[PDB]
Amino acid sequence: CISECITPNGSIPNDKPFQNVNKITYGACPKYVKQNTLKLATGMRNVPE
Amino acid sequence: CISECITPNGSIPNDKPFQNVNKITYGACPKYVKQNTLKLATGMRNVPEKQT
Amino acid sequence: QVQLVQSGAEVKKPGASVKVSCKTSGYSFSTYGVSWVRQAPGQGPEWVGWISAYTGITDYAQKFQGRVTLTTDATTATAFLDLRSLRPDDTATYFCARDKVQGRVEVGSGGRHDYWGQGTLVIVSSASTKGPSVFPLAPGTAALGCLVKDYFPEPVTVSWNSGALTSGVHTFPAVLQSSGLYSLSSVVTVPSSSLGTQTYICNVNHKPSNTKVDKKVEP
Amino acid sequence: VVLTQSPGTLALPPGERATLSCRASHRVGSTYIAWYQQKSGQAPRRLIYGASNRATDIPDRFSGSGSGTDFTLTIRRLEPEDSAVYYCQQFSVSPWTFGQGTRVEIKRTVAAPSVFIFPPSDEQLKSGTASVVCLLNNFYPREAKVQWKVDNALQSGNSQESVTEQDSKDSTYSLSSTLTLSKADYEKHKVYACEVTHQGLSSPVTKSFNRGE
Amino acid sequence: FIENGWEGMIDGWYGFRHQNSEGTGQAADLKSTQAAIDQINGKLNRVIEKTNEKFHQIEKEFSEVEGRIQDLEKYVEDTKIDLWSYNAELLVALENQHTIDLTDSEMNKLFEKTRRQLRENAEDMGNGCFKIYHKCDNACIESIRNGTYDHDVYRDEALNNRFQ
Amino acid sequence: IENGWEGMIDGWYGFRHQNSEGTGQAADLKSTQAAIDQINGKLNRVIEKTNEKFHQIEKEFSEVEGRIQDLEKYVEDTKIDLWSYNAELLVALENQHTIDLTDSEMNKLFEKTRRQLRENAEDMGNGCFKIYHKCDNACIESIRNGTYDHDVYRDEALNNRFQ
Amino acid sequence: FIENGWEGMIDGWYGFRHQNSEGTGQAADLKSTQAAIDQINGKLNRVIEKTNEKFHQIEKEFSEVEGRIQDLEKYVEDTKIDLWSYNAELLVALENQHTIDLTDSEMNKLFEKTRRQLRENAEDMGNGCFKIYHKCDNACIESIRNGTYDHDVYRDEALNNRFQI
Amino acid sequence: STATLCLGHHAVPNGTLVKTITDDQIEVTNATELVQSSSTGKICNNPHRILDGIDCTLIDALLGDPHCDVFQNETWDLFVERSKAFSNCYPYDVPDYASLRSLVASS
Amino acid sequence: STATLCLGHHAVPNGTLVKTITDDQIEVTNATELVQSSSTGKICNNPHRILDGI
Ligand SMILES: *[C@@H]1O[C@H](CO)[C@@H](O)[C@H](O)[C@H]1NC(C)=O
């Protein structure tokens, strides 16, 4: 397959800016962070009717 | 001359907060960054006039 | 599938204006804007403007502003380009192309000039139109041709046998004469045995002067 | 936002690597860059978008990269198919702008011109002028001289020439120069001759013809 | 103003709901919709604009106990992580607070555009609606939506229903 | 104001009027300095003198040493990458702000001017006012310099507006 | 608008000061007060929300001169400190600029709420007050404050004092 | 008689919770994940030239343990040492092992 | 009849492009460079006591 990021846990896709798989990496990879999830908002505040 | 920042590439002026000359420095120096240019805006959005 | 068919070459004089159509298909017209780029012969492309088929918004290059007007017709699925006060500077070939994604989620930049028009020539000259004379280029490998002589303006389209003979043909760049007109050669190298059996066609066609002259060659 | 791209042209053999640059006058997102290929006549075909990614149906010979101000397009192993002009373009900042354009010529082995002369048509003669055509066909490199002679009277400034673009199959050009006379001057001289100097010919080569025959 | 927001609006992101003689109806304002989008789009593009590449780095897992150098190799890499982690937490938080205020301002701005358009022919009901004080049939309504409503026309009619 | 005025060189924000006595222009110096003073002070914080460092670690190397050198290079690279991010983010934030700061300054001047005219004028929709009375040049500077008494032109204006 | 603010308001953070026939008087708007508080509260909680734990780290003071390793152990720890210090200066600065604009907008919002309510029965004096153009006794005043003022009621009275005399 | 015109925004039946400066949770129309949290569990052989040390460590291929002969004269972008690996030659040790490993690895 | 009064801001014939959160490029009236990009190529002997190991 193709994957520009390799980790011991396996290869990961670098479409995201950050990752939580392993601090050991090789190649074009997201930055390792302690968080396992950070949601970035892509829309307005949601208000029910 | 007078210059409070020295690098191998030569002396640089520390009037800016960042620099891109060399990561090796000595004295009161700007912080080395990978960017070779960062423009900080010192005025409003520039809008040309409508027409007629 | 997905395509952009533009209008045929127009020819206009220094004062007047012009309108170029770009017919789209194969994708839903209203979820994507259109970018327009022009190309002065021999020079590289320069951008003209952009219009959204979702929001009607436009962004003209500030070089043209005033002279240029982009519109879209959702029914026919066509973008239009109107340029006024034509200078001889504006003599160029004009391209439309899909651009930006509108409404839909987002990104990254997957196009952004996905697909382009075949291009549409605009000539801004004050000179007269003149149809070409077509002379035979009278003939072991052997060579023959046509000579398309003393015409204006461009373009002249030359093919062979409605396009049935494609291989071993070289149609040359039109060359400007001091007489103001154009001259153009087209040649074919063919095996010098097949002569009785074969024959040849000069699909010469100069459409600023409606001249379809398919005129022929033999030793 | 000006994109100056280099080198001007560049000629490299098949199976070598072209490495095209595109320096920008201001910093630009890696996402707002695109590369195009254009073979004269047809419209621009888009190779790369977002600086890094191939558009679909594009061989992997093509690939791109760049950070902020220096963008580059690499054709990894050239083919004769690839002789074209290449344009970088940015659409981060109105006006969307294009590059100067880098030409790529593929640098194949030397090839001599096949020289052919053509007398003026009997249909043309009687209409009042004469045009002698000389054709140099399927040669390499581009640099090829053509000199005319009228009963060895050495001509100049009444010929005018036009070169084809490099071929996409065999990577050879083709030339046609055209001597223009008056029916009065043409129906006065016998030996019309087209002498051709070129790298492919170890010494010039003339093809000629005697008028009427 | 609008306590709430409309489910079932699928034409776009901001819109108009009218009621007149000819009946009720709805329609989205595409221009201020894309305006929000284009910002989120570009903001989002800058965040995920492709990261760094890294190759031969230091070791970060260890089998045996080495003392001083290993303590330092672990401290360096931990210190790194903790910082980058803070960067990411702060980034998202800022970006979000902004993405909210961006979109709340877009609605807000559309409302004002619409109020300046009606000039003195209508009043703000208090829930982000307008009581237009004249016969505004469906042609008139789209005239407002598409930016062409001439107030100087319905001035007299409206002005008089409002005041006596 | 879908646009802004070229050729205004009196200041950064201004008034363009048109009345019987003719057209004319003039800059609002107070709200101009207001924008400036913020940009100024923001800019001063950023470039407030950076910091001094002397004997640090080595960062270039001639020979291959393995482990320690690998670490000395990782440390200094990691540093750089972070500071670089800080600077990119800083500028971006500061700029988005410097824009919204100056857009609000214009915005604020407009409101000041609307509260002043009270019920003697209407917002044309392009950031102008149709003042509904004879406002000669004395009256105009009265607005600009914060002294326009509406209670004075009330009756005149109020009646052109409605009857 | 209000080029000043009220000392001695201790009922809450935002309020109403009225003057009518029945006399002057004051009272705080609790809902928009808590609105500001709840934000500051939550912003503040996220900042001071539980820190890290760290145990066996590197050494950071030294007795002898060791050269290379020590030089690195001190560069690492200094580089750490300098960054975290920047983070903290920036954080507070941002958070504060926000905490200001948050509270300025809250006042601002209450004012609008109150203007939309009065509809066409009053005008903005210019200093963030209203000249209500009718007899508004104390009942009427709390009617505004507590979100129940029916304008359709005092319309005619007000409308006429405004456009006549 | 008269008419009513209303300005509004959309909303959706199941939003997503996100964080901001001032608050911990707040529902928005849509969001996107910024942290890559899972992996495929396998290593992609492109575009990086991988080389699988199978039963050999790197240092054993260097020196030329018998079973590590298949590695001779090899190249790699990324060498992969496996848990399963062993030595099976004359018993040795490398003062400064990790340095030699590192430096050959990046050669 | 009546009169018209307009509030406006200035603009300049050649702005400068800068970055923001939402926008990659955006023209503003003026900006300033924050990164020292070039050097004089020589080492200043003040105020630091330099010593040349020749
Ligand atoms: C956000 O929703 C869009 C539709 O607006 C969807 O296609 C996209 O993948 C969404 N992202 C996530 C993380 O759910």
Numbering used by the authors:
A (entry chain I): 277 to 325
B (entry chain E): 277 to 328
C (entry chain K): 1 to 139, 147 to 226
D (entry chain L): 2 to 214
E (entry chain J): 9 to 172
F (entry chain F): 10 to 172
G (entry chain B): 9 to 173
H (entry chain I): 9 to 115
Task: Please give sentences taken from the publication describing this entry.
Here we present the isolation of a broadly neutralizing antibody, CT149, from convalescent patients infected with A(H1N1)pdm09. CT149 Fab fragments were prepared and co-crystallized with H3-HA (A/Hong Kong/1/1968) and H7-HA (A/Anhui/1/2013). Crystal structures of CT149/H3 and CT149/H7 complexes revealed that CT149 indeed recognized residues in the stem region of HA. The heavy chain of CT149 binds into a shallow groove in the fusion subdomain of a single HA protomer, whereas the light chain binds to two regions in separate protomers, one consisting of residues in and near the extended loop of HA2 located in the same HA protomer engaged by the heavy chain and the other consisting of HA1 residues in the fusion domain of the neighbouring HA protomer.
In both structures, each HA trimer was decorated by three CT149 Fab molecules. While phylogenetically both H3 and H7 HAs belong to group 2 HAs33, and the epitope residues contacted by the CT149 heavy chain were quite similar between these two subtypes, the epitope residues contacted by the light chain of CT149 were moderately different. The heavy-chain paratopes in the CT149/H3 and CT149/H7 complexes were remarkably similar, whereas the light-chain paratope responsible for HA binding was larger in the H7 complex than in the H3 complex. The HCDR3 loop was observed to cross-helix A, at an angle of ∼90 degrees, enabling residues V101, V105 and V107 to create hydrophobic interactions with residues in the groove. In addition, the HCDR2 loop was found to contact the N terminus of helix A, enabling residue Y54 to make hydrophobic contacts with residue 38 (L in H3, Y in H7) located at the bottom of helix A. The residues contacted by the light chain are not conserved between CT149/H3 and CT149/H7 complexes, as a consequence of the divergence between these HA subtypes. In the CT149/H3 complex, the LCDR1 and LCDR3 loops contact HA2 residues from helix A on the fusion subdomain (G50, N53, E57 and K58) and also HA1 residues (L25, V26, K27, D32, Q33, T313 and K315) of the neighbouring protomer; the latter contributing to the majority of interface between the light chain and HA. The LCDR2 and FR3 loops contact I278 on the HA1 and K58 from helix A on the HA2 fusion subdomain. CT149 neutralized infectivity by all tested H3N2 isolates, although the neutralization potency varied by nearly two orders of magnitude (0.156–5 μg ml−1). Mice (n=5 per group) treated with CT149 (20 or 10 mg kg−1) 24 h before or after virus challenge were fully protected (100% survival) from challenge with maHK/68.
